[PDB]
Amino acid sequence: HAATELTPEQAAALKPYDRIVITGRFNAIGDAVSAVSRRADEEGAASFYVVDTSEFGNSGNWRVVADVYKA
């Protein structure tokens, strides 16, 4: 299994039980979103929502904060 990418429309109609944060030192946005898809599924979430992708203190090493939603 893997958590489904949830649109801001469906996400606005749901409240997250938790929010997962990962770090990704400049590889790919889809690489990071795949890690969010994995980890959200490992938390038992049906879906996830990428909130923000921001540089973790310094440039190059950014991080992805993302909500997670149950079924």
Side-chain angles (χ1 to χ4, degrees):
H1 277 257
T4 303
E5 185 179 279
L6 199 65
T7 58
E9 303 184 287
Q10 295 290 32
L14 293 177
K15 177 179 63 184
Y17 68 107
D18 184 71
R19 186 186 64 168
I20 64 177
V21 185
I22 61 171
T23 55
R25 205 297 173 194
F26 186 59
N27 294 271
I29 182 60
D31 179 75
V33 171
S34 184
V36 178
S37 182
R38 173 190 165 170
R39 176 50 55 175
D41 184 73
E42 299 179 302
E43 301 312 291
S47 304
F48 66 88
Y49 169 71
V50 179
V51 182
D52 182 68
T53 57
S54 46
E55 298 162 281
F56 184 73
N58 299 89
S59 189
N61 61 278
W62 43 268
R63 65 90 193 200
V64 182
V65 58
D67 297 307
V68 293
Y69 303 84
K70 291 299 302 303

